[PDB]
Amino acid sequence: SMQIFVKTLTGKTITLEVEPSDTIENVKAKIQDKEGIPPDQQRLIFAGKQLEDGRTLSDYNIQKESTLHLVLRLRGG
């Protein structure tokens, strides 16, 4: 329905075709198809807020040219 941008790990921007009703886990599955990163290892940041699983894109007011930032988890302890 709308086409959003994702900035990948190397800074390169890819495009995704999504719905406002799309869940976050659905978007992570779409990113895995283009980047090869499992959804459990993905973190998506929109406007400074991490997107939590189970919510939809409409919950975060994500519009057409919205940009998601893709980062991983660097675990430590």
Phi-psi region of 36 (alpha: psi -120 to 50; beta: other; left: phi over 0): left
- Residue among 23, 37, 53, 56 that touches another protein (CB under 8 A): 37
- Residue among 26, 30, 46, 56 that touches another protein (CB under 8 A): 46
The interface region with another protein, picked from 21-29, 38-46, 51-59 by CB under 8 A, is 38-46
By the 10 Å C-beta count (0-12 exposed, 13-18 middle, 19+ buried), 22 is classed as buried
Tokens of 54: 């189970």
The answer to the question of residue 7 lying near another protein (CB under 8 A) is yes
Phi, psi (deg, nearest 5) at residue 15? -115, 145
Which residues form the interface with another protein (CB under 8 A)? 3, 5, 7, 9-15, 34-37, 41, 43, 45-50, 63, 65-67, 69, 71-77
